[PDB]
Design a protein around this nucleic acid. Structure first.
Lengths: 317, 111, 122, 111, 110, 111
RNA sequence: AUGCCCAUCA
RNA sequence: UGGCUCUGCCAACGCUACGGCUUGGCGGGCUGGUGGUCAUACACGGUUCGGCAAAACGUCGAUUACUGAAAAUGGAAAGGCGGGGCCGACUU
């Protein structure tokens, strides 16, 4: 209702929403123990869930490690059907992560496009050290809270994601959203403060085309000082090169002209994982996974981590 | 108790579902006759179960309840004309779930 | 909340019933398109089609391998019934495309049944 | 056997007229009730021949299901087909064949 | 042997099937069940003869006994009259003949 | 031996057209004949998933019952009877399946 | 978020 | 869904407890979208070019004023700031 939004738990628990949440949570999880044990009495289950949420007695079943039980991924989907579009609407257009009709491509296309027009002569690329494991979960809930205003959605948000820690249990539906919202704070220190207008952020990676490589370096210093003091995230890699390095954005190397993609330790990792599975070595795979989850937490391996969790069930996070 | 309890709770399933299962059109006639044989013939499955004190008979009572839940799913699908509206599936699933609870307690009591 | 737990839960029966439901959801519509005459063939096909779910389900709860083979016999019979309504039903019942579609859908359930038979056999 | 069937003849001779009152609406329940009613004779007979108590308990299950059918036809069937009186008198007849079945169960499980 | 009983039971069927098709639709379930007992006992005999467990030779006897029940039931079923007592008497003679053969066969196996 | 089914499927292909010909008048005979004809495939299938001779004899019993059905449907009265030709020209088909069944029974019996 | 293939609907 | 424990008429495979029934005709009655699978083409992607930025959208003002003890699952706005929006051109 303009800021406000002070009655979301009424719409989160509308039956017709939990059925959408149900159909969304079951998309392709239709061969998981979770769906198949829930599917049995699905609509009697959604009637004990609706009425657990409609009361304020929902309590998240444990994060299996960070996957969730079907009941929970449905609660997360039922949140992130009412709560996501009141956050993903404040997300500045140039945020290209986990929002419909933006994404991998519309970002790389925006960048290439904004590279052709404006004829950028430089660019700042940055990246957040260990982003999800460093999101404040506290100054997050000062953004999940200048927007939710409903004292029951807020308590469901705080069950699905406690207000006490520094680790967004990475890779939920509630966590993709709240990480975009979170990294939307640096978008509103680029676009609002700092007034830079040729950028793209995809979750933790942030391209900032300039013309003055010295301005980009300023922008970066201002971005780091902000994100260190206000969000609590450091910058893993950065550079101020011309568009001759080709912005290494989102798997591509994006010149104004061409747009070479890139190679894939992915393949090494996929093969490593697949081997580990069909070697009975699914316990050193957790060590490897934890390792590659560090080499790829700078990267944007959410989809890939979901994908590898779906091939089997081994929780990457 | 037990067998008496199960079936007075299952009579509510029948009392809800038999009207639904008599509304299924003749077109969906084989499904209906088989659904009615699953619904009204589950009483015999319970009856046999509480006449043996053997858990395999109470597991085939669970199989019958599971098949009945299949029939709900299925009859909510049958796009042809139709039959069970999703609300009826929801309500019946609640009823069958109550029978499920009692069957579970009974399975446990035997265990 | 913790979803309503049925007893004797066999992932394999749940998965296989869920996948067999796609067979039913495909073949049942074209079992109901078989004309007036060829009604007995239809009723027998429908009782084989819709009745294989019970075979799987009882196999899942009463953990006894005989019931898993009875489920295979019912599917093998469903594969026969495909052949039957394909050609022998003289006014065309199933188009050759529909047999190809359903045969794969049945085969996915076939694989799951085979894996389940195997995991029990060990 | 011979005496159980002759006493169940009376159940049928009482209940079969009752099952033919069930209207067109519930014609599909009737067929199932008649197959339970008239088909319990085969259950008795097959146990009379092969005296394995397995066949004898299936006869008991059928009598128990017939008792369920009384409850169902009296009430759950919406134009409560069997009047409470008719259920009462039928249950007397079924009780007589119940007694004989019980004595027969007992005579078989003497040891 | 199965061939003899079945050929003699074919005479039961050939007598009773016309009669069991005349049973009014009012008693239509009873009719379809009687017909399925009548044609259907052939399978009981046939299974008994193409195998041997003696339980199959008792299930054939049970079916003959059930067929005898059906006769007595259909005789005096209600107001839409079915099998008249004469028809029951005639049929009982034929069923008795196949009963005798079944008994001798049960005995020769025993 | 799965040429059994694919030889039997020409019995079906011959007999099903003339089994759907049997008029309503002979509806119970038809339903039972069709369940004998089209349901013999399940008898063979079960036999081939086990190779137990009991299931092989049950397949033989079904072929024998199918032979009965031919002779029964012959003398079923009216211009609605399986013509004598068809009885003979299906007995030939069933005999071919009979031969293979016999060889299969023998293959199993002399392991 | 991506396509391929597939199903149905128009 | 070749139905009906459903009737009327009218015939007969028939059967009759002689009324009928059955069985046959013969009428009426009741009867692109969506899902789902699966894991430097040196030329431009409508990734084009201008104008606009009123509106609506986003954000901030703001869970603020205001109302009502109290915001209590009431509640702005001027304004600023965006372009995500708009309007054409040309192409799609």
């Amino acid at each position: 209702m303009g800021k406000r939004h002070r009655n979301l738990i009424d719409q989160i628990t509308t039956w017709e929403n939990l059925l959408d949440a149900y159909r969304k949570t079951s998309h392709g999880k239709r061969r998981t123990w979770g769906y198949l044990e829930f599917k049995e009495y699905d609509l009697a289950n959604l009637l004990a869930l609706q009425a657990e949420l409609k009361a304020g007695n929902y309590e998240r079943g444990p994060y299996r490690e960070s996957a969730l039980e079907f009941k929970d991924r449905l609660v997360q989907h039922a949140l992130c059907n009412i709560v996501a579009p009141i956050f993903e609407a404040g997300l500045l257009p140039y945020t290209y992560a986990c929002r419909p009709d933006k994404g991998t491509h519309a970002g790389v296309c925006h960048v290439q496009a904004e590279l052709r027009r404006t004829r950028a002569t430089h660019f700042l690329k940055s990246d957040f050290s260990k982003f999800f494991p460093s999101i404040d979960r506290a100054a997050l809930y000062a953004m999940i809270d200048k927007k939710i205003h409903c004292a029951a959605t807020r308590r469901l948000l705080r069950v699905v994601l406690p207000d006490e820690g520094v680790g967004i249990p990475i890779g939920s539906l509630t966590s993709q959203l709240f990480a975009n919202v979170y990294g939307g704070a640096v978008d509103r220190l680029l676009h609002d403060e700092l007034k830079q207008r040729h950028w793209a952020r995809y979750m933790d990676d942030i391209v900032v085309l300039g013309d003055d490589p010295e301005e980009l370096r300023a922008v970066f210093y201002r971005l780091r000082d902000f994100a260190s003091e206000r969000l609590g995230l450091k910058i893993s890699h950065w550079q101020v090169a011309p568009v001759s390095r080709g912005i290494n954005f989102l798997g591509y190397r994006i010149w104004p002209t061409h747009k070479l993609l890139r190679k894939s330790s992915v393949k090494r990792a996929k093969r490593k994982v697949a081997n580990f599975i069909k070697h009975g070595e699914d316990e050193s795979l957790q060590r490897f996974l934890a390792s590659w989850s560090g080499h790829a937490q700078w990267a944007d391996t959410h989809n890939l981590f979901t994908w590898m969790e779906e091939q089997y069930g081994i929780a990457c996070h | 108790y037990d067998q008496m309890l199960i079936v007075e709770r299952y009579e509510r399933v029948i009392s809800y579902l038999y009207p639904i299962a008599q509304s299924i059109p003749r077109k969906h006639g084989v499904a209906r006759e088989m659904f009615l044989k699953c619904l009204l013939g589950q009483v015999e499955l319970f009856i046999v179960a509480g006449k043996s004190n053997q858990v395999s008979k109470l597991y085939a009572a669970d199989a019958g309840l599971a098949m009945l839940r299949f029939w709900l799913r299925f009859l909510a699908g049958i796009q042809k004309p139709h039959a069970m509206t999703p609300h009826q599936v929801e309500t019946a699933q609640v009823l069958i779930a109550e029978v499920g609870r009692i069957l579970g307690s009974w399975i446990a009591r035997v265990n």
